Nucleic acid binder design. Structure first.
Ligand code: CA
Ligand code: CA
Length: 460
RNA sequence: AAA
């Protein structure tokens, strides 16, 4: 059992517990291929090792070995054939691959290669290489493999910064991880911009990195400093590196600023290069949604003639792109929610309902998203299905998720409005009286609350 | 990646 025990001491994708789910694997593979072709980074060893790991999980071990050989080839060709500790991730993945393929003599050869380097560098462990480069590699792998891994990713980069606070690579990874984690909390009450200072430091330490700049721009826009942010958008757009990724986030920036036509032009250029990106399809749908809202206001809700044709084009285009996003990544919860809401605009309540039913079964990484799912389904029930019974059920389910948020407050207000309406048509509805007491209790008005709870009690 |  020495071989398997030794393999478990290696630091590589096989021991990083990435937990890649089958239903997210097609999208992951597409994003890995996009990154190989279009993200300009100093080292590409990590991304080719992740592609090999994906190929292995797909049952394509010979294809996996080709990616590991490419990782080794690129490491030398583009860095003066110098030795680099990042090779140990590749060798570790070779050892695991050969073990799984039954090429056990070769697996042992790769264990021996790793051991030889750990000894040469006075590493305390025989096989587990302790160095900042491999902490970074672990972090980048976690960061590519879905939101459930982001706290672990951030901690990988933080471990480096606790020893070397000006390390450029880990500054970048820590800032991106922190930014995405801030996004998970962006609608929660009293959320704070933990990623802002990290992003400023990462831009300082990585002055040519346009990916970091556009995230800094977006966080500045979040914090009410759009003009400052726009300077970073312009700097990133002036450099050719990673252009297709810069376009995604610049487009978000311009959409949120109100320059939707400009956003769409950038996204359509980006789609020429990465047509499988679910982020691009979702962002494109969001632009069409924003244009729909614009047309509705200019025509005060009653577009006719060419305006009606334009509106229908926006609705059907948003549906097309939201459907494209969820075909490619069926776990993309918020894209299903935007899709359901757009089927309401199209007048197809059966397809809206179908997508809401799908959403009610999901288990998002961000648990608060289920507040939005119940809230919007409750609104659909109240306003499209004319079912106060089901509206109340789902407003209550949103409220039961206790985390204070924009949506939980809207759900309380919507429930209040609904029950006040029912009491106007029937002042002695006992269920409505106690729900109104509940609402007032959640708001803090304890005397009004107990009044309605008592009033409700008497009648019974 | 909605918000
Ligand atoms: Ca390039
Ligand atoms: Ca290749």
């Amino acid at each position: 059992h020495q071989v398997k025990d030794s393999l478990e001491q290696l630091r590589c994708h096989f021991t990083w517990e990435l937990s890649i789910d089958d239903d997210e694997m097609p999208d992951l593979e597409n994003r890995v291929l996009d990154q190989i072709e279009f993200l300009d980074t100093k080292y590409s060893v990590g991304i080719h090792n992740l592609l090999a790991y994906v190929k292995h999980l797909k049952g394509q071990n010979e294809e996996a070995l080709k990616s590991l050989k490419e990782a080794e080839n690129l490491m030398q060709e583009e860095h003066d054939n110098q030795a680099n500790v990042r090779s140990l991730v590749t060798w570790g993945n070779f050892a695991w691959m050969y073990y799984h393929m039954g090429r056990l003599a070769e697996a042992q050869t790769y264990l021996d290669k790793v051991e030889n380097i750990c000894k040469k560098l006075s590493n305390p462990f025989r096989y587990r290489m302790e160095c900042p480069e491999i902490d970074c590699e672990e972090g980048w792998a976690l960061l590519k493999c879905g939101g459930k891994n982001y706290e672990r990713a951030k901690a990988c980069f933080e471990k480096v910064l606790e020893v070397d606070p000006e390390n450029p690579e880990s500054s970048a990874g820590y800032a991106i991880s922190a930014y995405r984690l801030d996004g998970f909390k962006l609608a929660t009450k009293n959320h704070k911009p933990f990623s802002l200072l990290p992003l400023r430091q990462a831009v300082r330490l990585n002055p040519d990195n346009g990916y970091i700049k556009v995230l800094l721009a977006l966080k500045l826009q979040d914090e009410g400093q759009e003009a400052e942010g726009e300077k970073y958008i312009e700097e990133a757009l002036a450099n050719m590196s990673s252009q297709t990724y810069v376009f995604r986030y610049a487009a978000k920036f311009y959409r949120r600023k109100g320059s939707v036509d400009k956003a769409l032009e950038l996204l359509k250029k980006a789609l020429q290069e990465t047509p499988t990106s679910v982020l691009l399809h979702h962002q494109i749908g969001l632009c069409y949604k924003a244009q729909m809202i614009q047309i509705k206001e200019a025509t005060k809700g009653q577009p006719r003639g060419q305006n009606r044709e334009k509106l229908d084009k926006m609705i059907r285009s948003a549906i097309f792109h939201f459907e494209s996003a969820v075909e490619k990544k069926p776990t993309f919860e918020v894209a299903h929610l935007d899709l359901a809401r757009m089927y309401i605009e199209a007048g197809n309540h059966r397809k809206a309902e179908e997508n809401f039913q799908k959403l009610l079964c999901m288990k998002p990484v961000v648990e608060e998203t289920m507040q939005d799912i119940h809230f919007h389904y409750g609104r659909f029930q109240e306003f499209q299905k004319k079912s106060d019974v089901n509206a109340i059920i789902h407003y209550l389910k949103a409220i039961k998720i206790e985390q204070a948020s924009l949506t939980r407050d809207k759900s309380i207000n919507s429930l209040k409005k609904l029950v006040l309406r029912k009491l106007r048509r029937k002042a002695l509805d006992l269920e409505s009286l106690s729900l109104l007491g509940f609402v007032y209790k959640l708001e803090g008005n304890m005397n009004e609350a107990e009044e309605y709870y008592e009033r409700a009690e008497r009648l019974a």
